[PDB]
């Protein structure tokens, strides 16, 4: 029914023509999406990990391997406030039409979705964890290295991960950490590890995690599952927002302050093969 | 969801 | 109604047919313009910043945070003059008509706007201030680097932007400073930093500010919002001036000294998200 | 005969409409396929070589040349668990058989299968060799240099097969090895060998091997025939395996642990010219 | 009226159909239209310059800038003997008419005109200059460098224009200097600078002025204003000239020896911004 | 007579339709072909040469020319074996339809033809050179220089061929030689001689002679005459061939060891006009 | 009248369709033709020379323009007897046609004509002079340099003609000289004069005269007048030739020695300005 | 206004 | 088989 | 004059 | 033969 | 005419 034409619909369910564009804008910004692997889901589901192989009838022995099961779920709320200011009333939505409202929000809602998933996915910082983060797997299996940035330590980190079979892949390190990666040079073999032009640490690519969680550290992965799908939805109302903060004092009374907010309900889900390592600071 | 997973595989930093 | 035909219109608003040409020439010439992203506004616009911490039906008491509001205004007017003094009286322009005058005036007016805009907008010197500016934001947060042109200092400069989880995008170096930039080569990795052909410092485009408010300086930008509204709007002038100076000491008495000037009041607005770096010479 | 309408086809042979698409996906995935040719055949192919010499008419003085025949064969298999985990969704297959079934699983079975080929192709770690090519070709014709990374050594690496009347085509070097390729610069002629934009060593494209079986090595190729034949051949049983473990250790009793498994039996074949250069490392 | 048909009209003024072709030869041959600029003029135009202040209705400002007024004048002549070479008026001129005339001395007359423009334009050795010239601007504003053709000296030369907020565009240097341009081997980076195939120094096109007044040096140019106007005049008279030589010893009189002369006087003016650089050797 | 349709012709002559394709594949692969110039002939070619001098209507001094005539003939013949075996006996003939085999076997015979001819053309190997080879012309006029590969030594070779009024056109050097030249750099100016991307030595293009009759040898020619006039022919052989040998060291009886053999004869002629340069190794 | 038909025309004033291609081959091959300005005429021409100086419009005259009267004549003959031998009998001519002879004739007769002219044009060794030759001008205007090849000498050589007003324009030399031009390098300023890639001596372009007369010579050439108008003609007969010495020492009577001869006579002219320099060896 | 923003993205130094 | 041959020739890193 | 302007801008070494 | 001479002119290492 | 045109077009010194 809905397309362009009009917009005087406060509540509803978002049409899939505009949904997958919104998810397409979340796509690149989320670091765990780039590093992870994707297999399709509808609400609740179970999958099995790893890869299988044979050499035919020639050689029966060798090539032993493991299978493991896990169930996928959990919901993540999104409450918007910027929207309320840029558009006074719902007749203005109508004047734009149904299409352009979501095109205006296309960056805004997408920015906050990837921001929270990465904060609650790579670490357990926010209030939207559920299973086990990358940090949580490292809390189980003591894979800690002391705060020193040398060619031996990066090779040791990869070797430590390699020691339990699985080979290393892309790196997660914050933007401030990029400055320390510049000056890692050996005297005998005069070559720098970190390539400045193409963002890659030891050949493998890096992602600059825009968050205030890490300080001086490096993370790696390879084998990780992270596909999510349902429907975002839209609910427009004016109430006392609990998890937001007006100006700098107290909770935002919307009928008092005169805004028109919007909600997006998306689902968030993660499955991990539990063997990852972290490098952290020592101080003294 | 299939079309999402297809484009997700395409736009990935690590090559498959 | 008016197009070619004639030219006896003293006062008048320019049509959008001619507004895009004049602004197109302003876009390339101005340095701040080239770097910024221009969302549309009217007289004013209210923009909000920040995100929020959002869980799904659980919520623990943390991550309330701050939300910030901001609005923008103030204009940037400039004079044509040049055409007026070269080509005198209306009957002389009657042959040229409406279409001919704008094309011939095109580079003079466009050259004028950016010179004044950048002299007050980037460096806060020219007498047309509006709070929000590049040099003013550096007074709040000290991003100062000393006067030496080596790769490590440019790395350290970019590292200061990285400290507050922000990426480098472009550069601003003076035309006079272009000599010192090119003669910087590392001993180990024997490659030139500043490329002469493709104007870029660290694979990031440098833009040459013609204003004389710099010596040995480098400015950096990325997320930046300039805005524009309405029309250039022209008025023919045969009256006395206070602002301009006639060679020696007397003023531009247009009916006294037989000239025929032009007035062009353009409306341009600026907004800054903050965290912008700058290198300056120290010497002693 | 076969259509989209109906499923419940457990044991069967694929149509050429679907066999070519699934192969197309496996071609770009592979390393040996990207650096190799394709002669057609049915079961086994008889090949032969050499050019010979012949007189015009008279003398026939000192004319003596030889020629020898060759052979090619061998089959490879894989046992996927992933389609058996999907198997619960009977409505999927019943509603849209083949088209939607094989499209969903193009990575699921080809991704594992191509890595097995590369294990026995470029290395000999896999237990499905036939010609036992690259590893043994180095052992047969000792064309190895003591591993240090300089242009002189890269020229020497190419010189080994250039000496035996064979042109260099393309390189095989790790993603981790990419970092050491940047420091290659000669003292007299200040020019770079490896280009940042395109993964190529010289006028010669590089393929990055993901299988962790190289330290600091480079391999030249360009005289190989990779040959895929027959049909993938799908079987769908729900019974106990031999080469498998179910989570703890015990054999995956598929009736108890209610899954299914899809079998894929494609054909895999190679052939050699026995003139390849290999590099490794000096002391450590 | 005139086109082909006949030739007889001795005096007159050229048609625009035969003005543009002969003038095109001047432009392409000369080292000024190739490296300069153009506008139309009517007899002796007047130019006005410099940027005004203009406030934005807030405060008038304490900058206070000035306005500069300028002009251009003077024309050149040419009386060639080439028509005396092609004299035969009875037969040839009737067949040649008003079309083939100009085609036969299309290279000549234009040849003599283009050479003299640069002779009294780039240098000031001629006896028909009109003040504004490159050599004179260098005498006014000292930009003279004394040294060999080293990379740093070429950068220094260019930097003089950059020092007064002006960008370099192209180069003027003779073919004899090309030998010394070849040996510019840098200590770092690309070891070349000057491109051998395409005649360009720093990616800026070098123009080969083949004058007798240039020893071994480079001039930079990129801010000219050349102004051609008026269709050229032609005259046909067989007469005695005051100056000039008949053969070897004596004055050229027509009744003595039957020659025939052709005059072409093209009116042309110049202008400069008064900031152009020069390089020469060190006197020792 | 023939077209598509059928195939039961054991002996035969090729049509012009099929003759020029196989000859086209000979052209590009040959070294003497590309370097040398051409003309058509019949059975044999006789070309008459030399220059004269005369003023006209006068007799003066001396300097009368001399006459010399040159006739060229003979043929280089190349056998298959390989090609007959590919076709399955008379069954191919039963379903061939006079098209696909000349196309399938296009590069197999063409490769061997150039292989044998180049050995006879450039070197004096085999009993095929009835005329004078390049090596033989070097023995007549001693233009052999001894020394290691250095810039000046390569120019010295060209200088000596230039010494007798003849400009150097292009080099001939094998695949082993190509790899050796790369390390040659000029001391005075930091620039390289040999280029791999554009295969040329001293700005002169090179072709790799892939034969085992050279070590450190380079050859340059200006003029060269080669003739290819005739037809390839098509013959079957079920009987034994002396030139061909089986794997070990035996004559190979074709009735004994069930093979099929093809035989092709190309009427090719070669000729030189003396004065060719050469290089060779010293050892001791 | 003629076009193709079937030749049989022994005598013949050949048409301009086939003349101008044959003359074009003489032009490109000739070295004197590559450098000069060539006015047209029929049998003989009285014509004037030297470029016209500027009048100057406002300033009386200054430097005198200078004018001089000259004359032009003389014919050159050439017999391509071996080219006539190629076609044995009049029946063979019938199949060859009028048109075929000219295209196949074009290379040899053009070769002979340019070789004759340059030998009796630059030097005065060949005996078809017109007085005004380069060698004869050097005898009058003494411009001889001793056997020394250095940068200082080449500058001094150009300075000799510079002393008498004129500018050095271009060089004429042989291919043997290229070796001797390579060794010229100054130790203080390490740079070669002669460029190997682009054939230019001191920046000025060189042309290679392949004549066995000079040895260690550099010739300098500027403005030259010549004429190549006139129909070459084509006569062929079966008669004795006193010019063409056959085999050993005889007239070569055509009834005795059955051959066919062809004679072509092309009008040719040369003129000088009597200011040309020349270098020569001395030894002792 | 909207056309100016469209032109801006086309005539930017870095197109995005 | 036939399509395979053409794609193996086309869809490839090295191409002549 | 007007045609000259077009030719001057077109027939130039720098920027066409 | 004649076609070969034409292709020898076209398809060649050197062109004049 | 045509011969003079070819000479002008194919003179090496075209400065």
Residue numbers in the entry:
A (entry chain F), C (entry chain G), D (entry chain E), E (entry chain B), F (entry chain D), G (entry chain C): 26 to 309
B (entry chain f), H (entry chain g), I (entry chain e), J (entry chain b), K (entry chain d): 191 to 206
L (entry chain c): 192 to 206
Task: Give verbatim lines from the article.
Like other tailed, double-stranded (ds) DNA bacteriophages (order Caudovirales), the 80α capsid protein (CP, 324 residues) is first assembled into an empty procapsid, requiring a scaffolding protein (SP, 206 residues), which acts as a chaperone for the assembly process. The CP models show the expected HK97-like fold common to the Caudovirales, divided into A- and P-domains, with an extended E-loop and an N-arm that folds along the inside of the P-domain. Many SaPIs also cause the redirection of the helper phage assembly pathway to form capsids that are smaller than those normally formed by the phage and are therefore unable to package complete phage genomes. For SaPI1, we previously demonstrated that this size redirection depended on the SaPI1-encoded proteins CpmA and CpmB, leading to the formation of a 45 nm diameter capsid with T = 4 icosahedral symmetry.
There are seven CP subunits (A–G) in the asymmetric unit in the T = 7 80α procapsid structure, which are organized into A5 pentamers and BCDEFG hexamers. The 80α procapsid map had a density next to N-arm helix α1 that was identified as the 16 C-terminal residues of SP, which were built de novo as an 11-residue amphipathic α-helix followed by a 5-residue ‘hook’. The lower density of this feature is indicative of low occupancy, consistent with the previously estimated CP:SP molar ratio of 2:1. The hook includes the conserved RIIK motif that was previously hypothesized to interact with CP. The RIIK motif points into the hydrophobic cleft between the A and P domains, where R202, I203 and I204 make numerous contacts with the CP. In the preceding α-helix, L194, I197, A198 and K201 make contacts predominantly with the N-arm α-helix of CP. In subunits C and F only, residues Q192, R199 and N206 contact the adjacent CP subunits (B and E, respectively), presumably reflecting the hexamer skew that shifts these subunits relative to each other. In the 80α procapsid, the C-terminal 21 residues of SP form a ‘helix-and-hook’ motif that interacts extensively with the CP, especially with the N-arm. The rest of the SP was not resolved in the high-resolution map, suggesting that it is disordered and/or not organized with icosahedral symmetry. In the absence of CpmB, the less curved shell allows the incorporation of additional hexamers before requiring a pentamer, resulting in the T = 7 shell.
